[PDB]
Predict the structure.
Amino acid sequence: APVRSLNCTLRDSQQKSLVMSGPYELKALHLQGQDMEQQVVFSMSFVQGEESNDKIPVALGLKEKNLYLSCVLKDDKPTLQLESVDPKNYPKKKMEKRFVFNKIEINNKLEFESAQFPNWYISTSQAENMPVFLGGTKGGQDITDFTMQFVSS
């Protein structure tokens, strides 16, 4: 399909689930049971970019919503954010760079590195209920790896 995608969920290595904070923010937290359905279902798109056997470019939008994770400089610092797009032109095979993440297969875990800002990754905090953000450091206080779960569509 011109642009191929797949629906899925992500979970941090701490087993925290992602949910929508505001209209433009994601937060991570320990969730179980009935609460689990509050989690966000992404729609991962396989876009065009520099490819490898362990490094695939993707775009992460929300299922059925014209919102995409985007990387931008905000206050002279790489920043993660949800961005609105024309429901009619997206997704597309050739997404803009700010929308592109390199999906990296590590342990049996994943990492999402910004195509735009090398070595900047999608991260979560150890703490509960904090926002998902773009962190510039690996192997640290912050969490950079996740696992993914496929969902039926």
